[PDB]
Design a protein around this nucleic acid. Structure first.
Ligand SMILES: [Mg+2]
Ligand SMILES: [Mg+2]
Ligand SMILES: [Mg+2]
Ligand SMILES: [Mg+2]
Ligand SMILES: [Mg+2]
Ligand SMILES: [Mg+2]
Ligand SMILES: [Mg+2]
Ligand SMILES: [Mg+2]
Ligand SMILES: [Mg+2]
Ligand SMILES: [Mg+2]
Ligand SMILES: [Mg+2]
Ligand SMILES: [Mg+2]
Ligand SMILES: [Mg+2]
Ligand SMILES: [Mg+2]
Ligand SMILES: [Mg+2]
Ligand SMILES: [Mg+2]
Ligand SMILES: [Mg+2]
Ligand SMILES: [Mg+2]
Ligand SMILES: [Mg+2]
Ligand SMILES: [Mg+2]
Ligand SMILES: [Mg+2]
Ligand SMILES: [Mg+2]
Ligand SMILES: [Mg+2]
Ligand SMILES: [Mg+2]
Ligand SMILES: [Mg+2]
Ligand SMILES: [Mg+2]
Ligand SMILES: [Mg+2]
Ligand SMILES: [Mg+2]
Ligand SMILES: [Mg+2]
Ligand SMILES: [Mg+2]
Ligand SMILES: [Mg+2]
Ligand SMILES: [Mg+2]
Ligand SMILES: [Mg+2]
Ligand SMILES: [Mg+2]
Ligand SMILES: [Mg+2]
Ligand SMILES: [Mg+2]
Ligand SMILES: [Mg+2]
Ligand SMILES: [Mg+2]
Ligand SMILES: [Mg+2]
Ligand SMILES: [Mg+2]
Ligand SMILES: [Mg+2]
Ligand SMILES: [Mg+2]
Ligand SMILES: [Mg+2]
Ligand SMILES: [Mg+2]
Ligand SMILES: [Mg+2]
Ligand SMILES: [Mg+2]
Ligand SMILES: [Mg+2]
Ligand SMILES: [Mg+2]
Ligand SMILES: [Mg+2]
Ligand SMILES: [Mg+2]
Ligand SMILES: [Mg+2]
Ligand SMILES: [Mg+2]
Ligand SMILES: [Mg+2]
Lengths: 239, 14, 158, 95
RNA sequence: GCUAAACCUAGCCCCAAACCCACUCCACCUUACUACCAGACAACCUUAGCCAAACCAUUUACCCAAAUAAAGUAUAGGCGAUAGAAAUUGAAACCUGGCGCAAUAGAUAUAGUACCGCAAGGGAAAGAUGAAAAAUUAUAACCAAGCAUAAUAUAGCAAGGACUAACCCCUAUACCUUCUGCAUAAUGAAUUAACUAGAAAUAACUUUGCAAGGAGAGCCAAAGCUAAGACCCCCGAAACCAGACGAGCUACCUAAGAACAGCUAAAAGAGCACACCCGUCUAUGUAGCAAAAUAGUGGGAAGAUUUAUAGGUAGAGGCGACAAACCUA
RNA sequence: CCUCCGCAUAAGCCUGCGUCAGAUUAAAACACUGAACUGACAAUUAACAGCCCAAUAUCUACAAUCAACCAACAAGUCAUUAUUACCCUCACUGUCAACCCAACACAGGCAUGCUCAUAAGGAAAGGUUAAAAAAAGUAAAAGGAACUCGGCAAAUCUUACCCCGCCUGUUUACCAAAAACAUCACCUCUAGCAUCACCAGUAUUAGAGGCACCGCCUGCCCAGUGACACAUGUUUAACGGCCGCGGUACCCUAACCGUGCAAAGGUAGCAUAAUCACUUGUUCCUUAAAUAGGGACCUGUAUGAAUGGCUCCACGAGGGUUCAGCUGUCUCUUACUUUUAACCAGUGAAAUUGACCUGCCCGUGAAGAGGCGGGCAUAACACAGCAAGACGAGAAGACCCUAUGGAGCUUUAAUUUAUUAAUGCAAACAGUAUACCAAACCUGCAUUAAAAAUUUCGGUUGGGGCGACCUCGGAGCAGAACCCAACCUCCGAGCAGUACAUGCUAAGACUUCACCAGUCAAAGCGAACCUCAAUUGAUCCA
């Protein structure tokens, strides 16, 4: 088997990139994941998840201008093309972002919390307690891995001596360093639950194969399980 | 079951 | 790579078993080589080094059938060549320390031309010998002129 | 019974026969009674006495054991204090 | 008298002895047999199983020092099928053969060619004058089945007893195997030629030699020991395991392509309907045109569609809108 | 007269109907001389098509659909710049054909462009005759499904109802296309996360499953098993389950009661159903006639709710019933045409075959005779038919049984954990005031679990299965030495009680038809002066 991943390019760019499908196959050529294959062709828009990243030879916080809000075939939520200084990038559009708005990406953490409109990114310590937040990291400067899906949102619960506590959409709570950047507001493309597929053909266009016709008898896992919430997740190292 | 016996070709030189 | 019985009784199943050594990464110093090596080591060879009183002594004392390592045989050949050559081992300005390290291992240092072929596989030995006898061909012009001048001298001296 | 062995081409011997029977040089085989040391608490003294006996074998059994053993076990032995020395020969037997 | 028949010698086999090979020029690891360009990756690993143990579940000779003997002994072992040493002993340098085959034999061999297979792989058949063919002459015939010369004659396992006469008279239920028992309408067999199936020990028996000893070391011996003779078939599964070879069919996927008339267009995994894909029902066919076809009739035909090209996943597996489907009939 | 063809390119193939000679021979399914050929000779000429490019950075948000209005989703098929380097040129390869994959000059398979009937390309009839049977058509009086399992087929154009599945779609290449599988919708379970799938994704997500659009609903139960919690619990849209007797008025249950048990005792709904049998249940419509169809009743004692229940729109080569029509389906068949057929000419198979000089009736017999017994019949020999027999040909029956012959699958069959994942201990490390903490990866051991692996699935048996039995003794059968079967008739046994010489030895005997086992016993040495019928278990090994 000769499998080379399409994710092979070391320079960020705005133009969409051709992405090869997989069919649920790993590098060996065998099926690793079932029900995947053969949908509409797509191109990849590169999303800059490190929301606060200053340009070259520039250091402090910066402003940006929402040039457009576009549909992304590769994700649930839509993506905003946003320009600033002399460079443009794709980011995850939050709700009520439209063309012509201005967005603030700030680093300095304040003695007193700041008032943030629904599109800016501040360190979680600078934000008011109880705000709805999205695109959060775990280490400072790691980049946004948590909440990123359409309409989903998390809430900052408390601030501790050097950390901040955040509730995830699955209600699990996690503590991150105070200097961890996150964006204010809920993610755009709400009402994504109400989407009705209508027919199996639309699933096929979406690129998911039908389920196996073999009849599996249900085991002990099948009944409803009422478990307590899992313990706190902590991302703060301590000697 | 489906019992089938494929035919046998003799060598062409004969 | 052997086999075992299920509960150490022969009337049970026979299962193929593998026993692996417990390997550790440790750092060593060679007084002859004046270099620090990081090697994947085990408790047995740590104990052997302790018994031999030093990595240099362990490598120079243990035979190939016991070192069981091409790395060990290469180290042995390096130390043997150093001892046979009596070369400027440590550095200038430390001749007495160099000599002291050399005399710590007098019961060694086989001749120079013999210490080269120590720890060499058959392929390495054949390659070394082939590059030894490279000897690109000599033109026949020189041979013929030497023969003719020797003939001329023979005829003239008579 | 391995009439021909894969190493020497020789006849082999069954060692169970050797472990269970004694061969006199005349051709007679001597055995022990079965059950002579099993459940002696349910047996009468006469039964136990007849079970403790060393008895001879059939003609058929003797030929079978001769086939199952090799000629090494049929040679004439001259042990020092053999308790069966006098039994290795036959006397006053007519045809 | 046609078809035919017949023939010796290509070569081969088993030993012995001896350690054996390979660049004329050019091309050849990429799609081998390709004159000429910048990531330099790289091998070292306990076989298993059939089978035997009358099942099978521990176990079951097979490994590379001349012989012989110790010895099938010590030992091992569901202590059972069977497995099985060593110490020790001692093992005379040189000689080119055949109670081997002779074209269905002997090598598969005229050749690993033709042919078959995608591939790994499998694998044939056959020739005959003579000193001279720069003697094409007349000889050389005679011999299997099959025929021809030359169809037939009431009635009957095909004949036998006969008889002056072929038939007519009288008598007569093919063979082999398998069975309690077969003419059995139970098996097998068209027929000819060739090929095609009993291998050995312990202990006995007979015939010699020598004889309380025999034997050319070892072993046996209260007439034994030594030697010889005589003696135990052929074909056939469904299986299991190891290592290769296969996705040019088909299942699914990846890359990059192509096709879908006309009408109604409700907007459409909408309707009629071509091309195109499929295969409902009937008839034919059934050694067929075809190892799944033909004619008609049908389902779909802008989609979860059909389809060309290249690539990927492989058997203790792959792939599967699970039919135990498909993975070269 | 036909054309549903053809001409190109791609792919495939590789000289394979060009000329001359041999045609005496040889393949031509026959022939002339050329598609089923032998030798020699000759040809496919690049512009078409292949065969490409100097680096290092940098750039590349705005589909297509006449791209213009409009309108979307499944979100898309095409672009540079900056600097350095660079002044030689038209090489090489494919180019033929009646052609490829199917063993064939095979009614099969085969991508794209072009005209969609042609300006390409082709020939269904060797000759004759006009039988049967067979194939494909055409026409048919009167009737019009009376045929038949069934309106199969054909001809005409077609109304209404029901069951199942929502629908389009998929499937057993080669006997099943469906009600089976999928499917939008609904629901359960698992997962807090970055570079090789999932995914360049992040709980409105991803994955493992059930059920099956929608509409109304989905009732009770955690006793048991499984799974999750280690606080003795939670969980059924998890595996699954949702009572019994008796008294109960003339008929029936029955509301009701006494009781027992359980986790709950089947709720709604629907209902003789694709739902064990009874069963052609009862009843109305439908027909002249109704084991068919539709509508109602619930003992459905085995219906029933995501094992989803019940209605309904649309749909269906699904399975049933029906009006009307019109049809050779049929009463009831007939005529013609073509193929086939039969004869003449050419070429020329296969299954099969012990040998055959190969009759009928009755009987016999390994129980169904051409061949045997008794009768009868009987010159020889082609051609066309037919299918009663030759227990006709084909395939060493697939059904059944057997084999200490296999294999697939499932487990709660036996054995094991080599492997993966968890734990615990050990090894490896390091500070620490007489105590403690033990990061991660390896390695050894032990336990647990998942996944598996190997192997087997007794026998008797008036076939096998099911039932019953398997060892030992007494009686009968088996009457008077011994023996003697039965899935034959009847009884029993798997102990018990008392001494502790129930010590030791040893002639001679018996013997359950073998062996192994089993039985009796004189004398003797010692010491006083054994009942009972069976009452049982080898070797190895412990
Ligand atoms: Mg699903
Ligand atoms: Mg399902
Ligand atoms: Mg066996
Ligand atoms: Mg056997
Ligand atoms: Mg068996
Ligand atoms: Mg020896
Ligand atoms: Mg030959
Ligand atoms: Mg041959
Ligand atoms: Mg003849
Ligand atoms: Mg007669
Ligand atoms: Mg019989
Ligand atoms: Mg007879
Ligand atoms: Mg017969
Ligand atoms: Mg038979
Ligand atoms: Mg036959
Ligand atoms: Mg077997
Ligand atoms: Mg198997
Ligand atoms: Mg393919
Ligand atoms: Mg449609
Ligand atoms: Mg249509
Ligand atoms: Mg099924
Ligand atoms: Mg099935
Ligand atoms: Mg051309
Ligand atoms: Mg064919
Ligand atoms: Mg024309
Ligand atoms: Mg014609
Ligand atoms: Mg005609
Ligand atoms: Mg004709
Ligand atoms: Mg009519
Ligand atoms: Mg009728
Ligand atoms: Mg009728
Ligand atoms: Mg019809
Ligand atoms: Mg359907
Ligand atoms: Mg499919
Ligand atoms: Mg089929
Ligand atoms: Mg199909
Ligand atoms: Mg069909
Ligand atoms: Mg379904
Ligand atoms: Mg429920
Ligand atoms: Mg019923
Ligand atoms: Mg009817
Ligand atoms: Mg359909
Ligand atoms: Mg003819
Ligand atoms: Mg008869
Ligand atoms: Mg006839
Ligand atoms: Mg006959
Ligand atoms: Mg027959
Ligand atoms: Mg048979
Ligand atoms: Mg048996
Ligand atoms: Mg039986
Ligand atoms: Mg019976
Ligand atoms: Mg007896
Ligand atoms: Mg007495």
């Amino acid at each position: 088997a000769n499998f080379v991943s399409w994710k092979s390019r070391t320079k960020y760019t705005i133009t969409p990139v051709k992405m090869r499908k997989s069919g649920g196959r790993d590098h060996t050529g065998r099926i690793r994941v079932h029900g995947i294959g053969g949908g509409h062709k797509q191109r990849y828009r590169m999303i800059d998840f490190l929301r606060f990243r200053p340009e070259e030879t520039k250091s402090g916080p910066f402003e940006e201008k929402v040039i457009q809000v576009r549909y992304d075939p590769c994700r649930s939520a839509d993506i905003a093309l946003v320009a600033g200084g002399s460079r443009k990038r794709w980011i995850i559009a939050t709700e009520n972002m439209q063309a012509g708005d201005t967005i603030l990406n700030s680093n300095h953490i304040g003695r007193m919390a700041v008032a943030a409109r629904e599109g800016d990114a501040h360190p979680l310590g600078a934000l008011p307690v109880g705000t709805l937040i999205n695109n959060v990291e775990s280490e400072p400067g790691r980049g946004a891995q948590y909440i990123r899906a359409a309409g989903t949102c998390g809430v900052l619960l408390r601030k501790v001596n050097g950390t901040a506590i955040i509730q995830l959409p699955s209600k699990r709570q996690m503590q991150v360093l105070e200097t961890c950047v996150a964006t204010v507001g809920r993610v755009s493309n709400v009402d994504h639950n109400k989407r009705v597929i209508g027919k199996a053909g639309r699933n096929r266009w979406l690129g998911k194969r039908p389920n196996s016709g073999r009849w599996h008898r249900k085991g002990g896992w099948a009944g409803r399980k009422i478990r307590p919430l899992p313990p706190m997740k902590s991302y703060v190292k301590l000697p | 079951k489906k019992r089938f016996t494929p035919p046998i070709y003799q060598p062409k030189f004969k | 790579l052997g086999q075992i019985y299920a509960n150490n009784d022969k009337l049970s199943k026979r299962l193929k078993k593998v026993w692996k050594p417990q390997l550790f990464e440790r750092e060593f110093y060679s007084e002859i080589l004046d270099k620090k090596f990081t090697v994947t080591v085990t408790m047995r060879t740590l104990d052997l080094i302790d018994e031999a009183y030093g990595l240099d002594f362990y490598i120079l004392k243990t035979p190939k059938e016991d070192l069981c390592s091409k790395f060990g045989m290469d180290l042995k050949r390096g130390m043997l060549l150093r001892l046979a050559r009596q070369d400027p081992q440590l550095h200038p300005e430390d001749p007495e320390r160099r000599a002291a390290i050399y005399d710590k291992y007098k019961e060694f240092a086989i001749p120079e031309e013999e210490a080269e072929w120590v720890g060499l596989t058959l392929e390495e030995a054949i390659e070394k010998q082939r590059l030894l006898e490279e000897k690109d061909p000599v033109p026949l012009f020189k041979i013929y002129v030497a023969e003719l001048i020797q003939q001329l001298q023979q005829q003239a001296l008579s | 019974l391995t009439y021909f062995s894969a190493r020497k081409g020789k006849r082999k011997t069954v060692k169970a026969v050797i472990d269970r029977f004694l061969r006199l040089h005349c051709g007679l085989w001597v055995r022990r009674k079965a059950g002579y040391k099993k459940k002696l608490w349910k047996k009468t003294p006469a039964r136990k006495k007849r079970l403790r006996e060393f008895v001879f074998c059939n003609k058929t059994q003797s030929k079978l054991l001769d086939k199952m053993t090799t000629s090494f076990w049929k040679r004439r032995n001259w042990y020092v204090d053999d308790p069966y020395q006098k039994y290795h020969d036959r006397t006053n037997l007519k045809v």
